[PDB]
Amino acid sequence: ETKCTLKSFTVEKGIYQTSNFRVQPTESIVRFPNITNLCPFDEVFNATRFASVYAWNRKRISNCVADYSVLYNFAPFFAFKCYGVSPTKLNDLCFTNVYADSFVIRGNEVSQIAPGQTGNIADYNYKLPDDFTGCVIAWNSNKLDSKVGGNYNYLYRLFRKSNLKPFERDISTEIYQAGNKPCNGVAGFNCYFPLRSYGFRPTYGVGHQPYRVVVLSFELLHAPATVCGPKKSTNLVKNKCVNFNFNGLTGTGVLTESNKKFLPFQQFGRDIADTTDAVRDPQTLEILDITPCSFGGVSVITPGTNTSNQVAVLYQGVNCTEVSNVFQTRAGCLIGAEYVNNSYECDIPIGAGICASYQTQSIIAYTMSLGAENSVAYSNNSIAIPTNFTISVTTEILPVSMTKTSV
Amino acid sequence: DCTMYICGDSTECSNLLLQYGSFCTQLKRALTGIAVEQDKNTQEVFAQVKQIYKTPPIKYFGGFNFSQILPDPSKPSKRSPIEDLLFNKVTLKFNGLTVLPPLLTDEMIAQYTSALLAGTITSGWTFGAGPALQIPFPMQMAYRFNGIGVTQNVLYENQKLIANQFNSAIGKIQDSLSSTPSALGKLQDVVNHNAQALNTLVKQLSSKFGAISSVLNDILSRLDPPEAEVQIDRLITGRLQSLQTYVTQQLIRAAEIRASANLAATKMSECVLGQSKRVDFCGKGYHLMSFPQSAPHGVVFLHVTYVPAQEKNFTTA
Amino acid sequence: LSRLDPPEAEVQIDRLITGRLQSLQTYVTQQLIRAAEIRASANLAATKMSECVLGQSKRVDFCGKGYHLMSFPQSAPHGVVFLHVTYVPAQEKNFTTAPAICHDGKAHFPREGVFVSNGTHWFVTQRNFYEPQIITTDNTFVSGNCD
Amino acid sequence: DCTMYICGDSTECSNLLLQYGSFCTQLKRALTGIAVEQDKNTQEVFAQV
Amino acid sequence: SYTNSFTRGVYYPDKVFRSSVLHSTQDLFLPFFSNVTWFHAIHVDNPVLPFNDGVYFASTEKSNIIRGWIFGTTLDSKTQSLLIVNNATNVVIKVCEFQFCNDPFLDFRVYSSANNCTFEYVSQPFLKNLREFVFKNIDGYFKIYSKHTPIDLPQGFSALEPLVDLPIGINITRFQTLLALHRSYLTPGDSSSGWTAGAAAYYVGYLQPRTFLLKYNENGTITDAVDCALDPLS
Ligand SMILES: *[C@@H]1O[C@H](CO)[C@@H](O)[C@H](O)[C@H]1NC(C)=O
Ligand SMILES: *[C@@H]1O[C@H](CO)[C@@H](O)[C@H](O)[C@H]1NC(C)=O
Ligand SMILES: *[C@@H]1O[C@H](CO)[C@@H](O)[C@H](O)[C@H]1NC(C)=O
Ligand SMILES: *[C@@H]1O[C@H](CO)[C@@H](O)[C@H](O)[C@H]1NC(C)=O
Ligand SMILES: *[C@@H]1O[C@H](CO)[C@@H](O)[C@H](O)[C@H]1NC(C)=O
Ligand SMILES: *[C@@H]1O[C@H](CO)[C@@H](O)[C@H](O)[C@H]1NC(C)=O
Ligand SMILES: *[C@@H]1O[C@H](CO)[C@@H](O)[C@H](O)[C@H]1NC(C)=O
Ligand SMILES: *[C@@H]1O[C@H](CO)[C@@H](O)[C@H](O)[C@H]1NC(C)=O
Ligand SMILES: *[C@@H]1O[C@H](CO)[C@@H](O)[C@H](O)[C@H]1NC(C)=O
Ligand SMILES: *[C@@H]1O[C@H](CO)[C@@H](O)[C@H](O)[C@H]1NC(C)=O
């Protein structure tokens, strides 16, 4: 690695930095609140009785969790079709309005509830837009919406002057003028009533049994998308650097226990350097500190390929408790060398007053010696007078000029 | 870390970072060169002596008092009261920014300072020009007074007065260094500059440099990969420029520190390890001797000066 | 300029020029810093040449470690090597020292050197070489009594 | 002054300039430091007496 | 009348924690030493109150004097307006499109003629009894900050803590207070219902985009905040 970093084959003696040590996260936990609200789908699917098709009700949902889990409500659906939105991908989408329309029609009339259809229910009772984005759920309800004597409680409009607009509701009961005179508002020849009854019976055929059909209208009006389904629910890893996604706040690190108290409304937390070091868990009220795990830099201490090939590793600025004689110093932690107790001359600088060398055998590590020890006898009546002279030569090399270059 | 500071735990960001060139292997190289150069300036001034000298047990040099400059064996850290006072006044891994500790700690520099003090007190100036020669302190002071032209009689007769003046000056050194905290600024402001250099990089990471967001997790989740590549490229360019200007400032400050360290080593060699005839290179006035004291990021020289006073008018021919 | 048309490849050339200018400005800054460093080194070398080769200086370690006597320069393709001749004392010996000598009620002090004693004897010497000489009036001066 | 050198009589330009960061904050600080240092060099040679 | 807001109008700029540090932020704050309007002697006109940069509402009511607030565009037909009513143990916030009179009163129960909306937002009821409120509307969020501190406006320091958020975007340009009395007045045109009651006073102060430097202590509570465009020292 040192040869690749220096781009050579015969490295010299010393310490060289090659790369950095990083601990990869094992898991990735996400924590959101358990539940705040929920769409009342138990009311629009498990009601005691639904309304007619000419007077269909519409319930607005704007402050609830859009949890699409219709599977537990009569899972053997007879007609489960989706328009514009995928069936399974709908659970991970946000919208503006979650208007839900419900009505009861015949078995052979469920096909008319679709974008671009022609018939009595589609044109005179309930019309869907062409570019409709939603889902249509229909299930059999013969046991509930039919009696032996005839369930004439559900009515439908059969005659009307013109077709209904998409998402239009009309409850008018005016006598339809089929002839030339308005009949002055009486029932007679060419004066027919618009609403007709069904009279569901349990002995009817599959095409005539009542089918509770519900329409989930979806639309996006560039709103903050208050409605949203469930996100996730995981545990809390301790003493290990993992990936946290707390309420959109994403990061990687260790979540350790702390003792500082926060405010009831404060959830996040930053230091003076604008670094996220504290975040409140959405599951339970408890603050934890964000501290990174083992992180630093690796350095190879080599005596040079001319002598031998045994090298030593040094992790700088990181404790080596977590992930060959291991020894902890003040400037880092070195492996591959043994700490000697006799101080010699410093050869390879490491830091904090520790230097490595080759004993001649293996890499050593010793506290650098500042020199020898010599204490002169200081006396008020003694002196040291020289006797001999020595003429020595001292070399002092200093650069003068440089390489004149131009581009 | 040129890979971590620009790219935050991202693989494609690191794959795109190598397209700029060899700047990651150049800025880190310049930084480690600055570190090695700073590791050498500490050995050109404090490590001038070859052998460590010690103080004799008899605390009687002739009448002078060196208790405030000699190390005190009572305290755990073997330093002088002046060094302990100076140490209590210098106020001292985030996003891939580490601080490498120096080789020579505060203990080895203290040992070098004590050795230099012992050499300049017991041996005089012979410890810095060859073998150490024993010599009494009053005779060393007589040599230093004769080196500037003053006869040795004024010292061999009026010795108690000079000793009392030196003791009073050593005592008032601490009272003068206690008040006016702006005196120890040259050792702090540069450190403050580090506080304005190591923290200014993380402060600029919150800026989007024109992008939609500052973190990569939002860009790689909101926008599409093919169209968000220009935003990542612009962020990498901005971070590279913000790191290059920091490297340039660090180079300039390292050159300044190198010049200051060369000047300090020259003053240590020409004032502590001998007496110089220069005017104000070893303090204003007539220089006699100099005592060095260590500091976590510098050296304090106390120069003893002989100043004439109480002059009178006379006739000359 | 061959794969894409100039009207559709202008931003690429602009970004290339910007990147190359940014890479060259850093080189220019490094060259300026290194030129300042070399200028300081050359000024120091010229000062040492003037104060060590063209005369003798009283500085301690500016013209070599020890007592400087002379200096010889030697050229090199990118620098200069100064060979400093240093006089170093050695083979020192212990002797007894005294500030002055009180005789005839007067305290005499030496002019050059100090008084060395090796046992029931006293001589005058210098501060750099042992030369025992009898205490005479030429190398001594009276400056009062030993009170 | 970067606010006037980079943006000539423009408010949106000044708003977008702060988005870049604290480049001007350190630039003007270095300029003031250079000014103070040049004001100090005249007192170390002429103001010795 | 007109009073001077010496050192009040500060709130938390974000839901972050800090420990004895300094934060300079450019937000929409109330300028210190500003000339606010004190409507104390107006005991039921001037119903034109803008909502440009927010509302700083200071109250010193004894007990249950104010019944709520209104925030609309023009208070006309087909106008998105939010009415907030604070009862004894319940609070309601309803946004709808309906016309309002000059001074909607409560004692009453039905303000307008018809209110056909299906909005639902229920929270904790809000209402030496100083009560400060800061109302802003930004990024489709109608943010409100409430604080109940003892003691008109003294020289103390008290921040505004965010409690609830409402995602809604409306060009609000109106502001109306809801007074509570005893006598009945069903006529919407007659704007004269002065009755002897406790002290009623609603301060009105407009916010401004300014830069504030706040100091966060070790506990994470705003204890000091200075402006940058009112004094050379600041
Ligand atoms: C979520 O459930 C846990 C376990 O019962 C509970 O401690 C916590 O308070 C719940 N969250 C909220 C917001 O109530
Ligand atoms: C090998 O080469 C290195 C390079 O400087 C040198 O330091 C070392 O002494 C050499 N070893 C031998 C055994 O020649
Ligand atoms: C590293 O961890 C060990 C284990 O507790 C500890 O004894 C040692 O002091 C740590 N090193 C540093 C520099 O804190
Ligand atoms: C140094 O001393 C320690 C403790 O006395 C011992 O554990 C270690 O083995 C010694 N090292 C060597 C190289 O002997
Ligand atoms: C030297 O001074 C210190 C205090 O400055 C004092 O405690 C000590 O006794 C003095 N020693 C002598 C020998 O005067
Ligand atoms: C010498 O005399 C002048 C006036 O003739 C006077 O100003 C000066 O102070 C005198 N010198 C001293 C040392 O008093
Ligand atoms: C002088 O004497 C001391 C001890 O009395 C001794 O350590 C020293 O070596 C002697 N000097 C020489 C030059 O031998
Ligand atoms: C001292 O040195 C002198 C040199 O002139 C010599 O004559 C004398 O004998 C010496 N005395 C002793 C005791 O060595
Ligand atoms: C506030 O404004 C009113 C009228 O706008 C004025 O009468 C009053 O003096 C002002 N108050 C201050 C403190 O300026
Ligand atoms: C009105 O206040 C009463 C308590 O006096 C409370 O029971 C009721 O729910 C409140 N009504 C609304 C709509 O908040």
Residue numbers in the entry:
A (entry chain A): 298 to 620, 640 to 676, 690 to 736
B (entry chain C): 737 to 828, 854 to 1078
C (entry chain A): 981 to 1127
D (entry chain B): 737 to 785
E (entry chain C): 27 to 70, 80 to 142, 157 to 176, 187 to 210, 215 to 297
Q: What did the paper state?
A:
The trimeric spike protein is a major membrane surface glycoprotein of SARS-CoV-2 that mediates the binding to the host receptor ACE2 and subsequent viral entry into cells.
Dimeric hACE2 bound to Omicron BA.2 spike trimer with a dissociation constant (KD) value of 0.4 ± 0.1 nM, which is approximately 11-fold higher than that with WT spike trimer (KD = 4.7 ± 0.6 nM) and is nearly 2-fold higher than that with BA.1 spike trimer (KD = 0.75 ± 0.1 nM). We observed two distinct structure states of the BA.2 spike trimer-hACE2 complex. The third RBD is in a clear down position and shows the direct interaction with an up RBD, as it was observed previously. Particle classification reveals that about 42% and 58% spike particles bind with hACE2 in 3:3 and 3:2 molar ratio, respectively, albeit an excess of hACE2 were incubated with spike trimer during sample preparation.
